[PDB]
Design a protein around this nucleic acid. Structure first.
Ligand SMILES: [Mg+2]
Ligand SMILES: [Mg+2]
Ligand SMILES: [Mg+2]
Ligand SMILES: [Mg+2]
Ligand SMILES: [Mg+2]
Ligand SMILES: [Mg+2]
Ligand SMILES: [Mg+2]
Ligand SMILES: [Mg+2]
Ligand SMILES: [Mg+2]
Ligand SMILES: [Mg+2]
Length: 190
RNA sequence: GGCAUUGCCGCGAAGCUACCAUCCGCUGGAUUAUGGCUGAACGCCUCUAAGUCAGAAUCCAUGCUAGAACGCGGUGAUUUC
């Protein structure tokens, strides 16, 4: 319909420096730093008062101003990931064969190996994305916690660890076996 | 020794040859289908719209064959008593 001017509202908390050049966003907070390259969107960022940044689309169609809230959510995810962090908790689900998941070291690359998935002799290796740290929960049975600054890195590494444990040639409604995301949340949240 | 249009029989080196004999037949990337991540549109949801992950005997390379006789390069020597 070619909307005149659409606005979204990125709120910047304390301790967080959101420095935006052309369309390269750099968010520095207590937990670290994150950099996004939003050069594929055609939006305009304006800082209001050091706690608020507007992002705007001028003369945008429906598919263009659909990407404005995506951009606002992406920079909000950067801000949330460098303030509170991100923490995805996965559970191992098996029927008979226990899934033995360890973290292994292969010429300095930090894989997660999965052995005995449905009695396979195949060792399923999932590399750990940089920024993502892996721990295995004590006092919660069969839980792996992937945490980091980037929701994209953390959630894609969790998705990789899930997708490596897919069941082939079987009814997957009965063979419900794998590693699944049971929780998405933050590191220091209350 | 000759001739029998290589006279015939047995063995027969060399050469040629046989899945009738042996040897050899490479591994990276990009993808489709599909399953996903982040995520709006549509305050929710959503693999999709922006962005992105994995992935077929596919595709393109690595490898292999020919080398443009009007594609190119490096280098040697370049004529007399
Ligand atoms: Mg069957
Ligand atoms: Mg005669
Ligand atoms: Mg004779
Ligand atoms: Mg043959
Ligand atoms: Mg989602
Ligand atoms: Mg797709
Ligand atoms: Mg797309
Ligand atoms: Mg890929
Ligand atoms: Mg290669
Ligand atoms: Mg030639």
């Amino acid at each position: 319909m070619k909307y005149i001017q659409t606005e979204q509202q990125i709120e910047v908390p304390e301790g967080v420096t959101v420095s935006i050049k052309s369309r390269i966003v750099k968010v520095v907070g207590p937990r670290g730093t994150l950099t996004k390259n939003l050069k594929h969107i055609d939006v305009t960022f304006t800082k209001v008062n050091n706690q608020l940044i507007k992002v705007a689309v001028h003369n945008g169609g429906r598919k263009h101003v659909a990407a404005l809230r995506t951009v606002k959510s992406l920079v909000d995810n950067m801000i949330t990931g460098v303030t509170k962090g991100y923490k995805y908790k996965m559970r191992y689900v098996y029927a008979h064969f226990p899934i033995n998941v360890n973290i292994v070291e292969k010429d300095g690359a930090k894989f997660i190996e999965v052995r005995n998935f449905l009695g396979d002799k195949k060792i399923r290796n999932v590399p750990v994305r940089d920024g993502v740290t892996i721990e295995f929960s004590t006092n919660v049975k069969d839980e792996i916690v992937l945490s980091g600054n980037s929701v994209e890195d953390v959630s894609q590494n969790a998705a990789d660890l899930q997708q490596i444990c897919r069941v082939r040639n079987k009814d997957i409604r009965k063979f419900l076996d794998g590693i699944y995301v049971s929780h998405k949340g933050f590191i220091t949240e209350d």
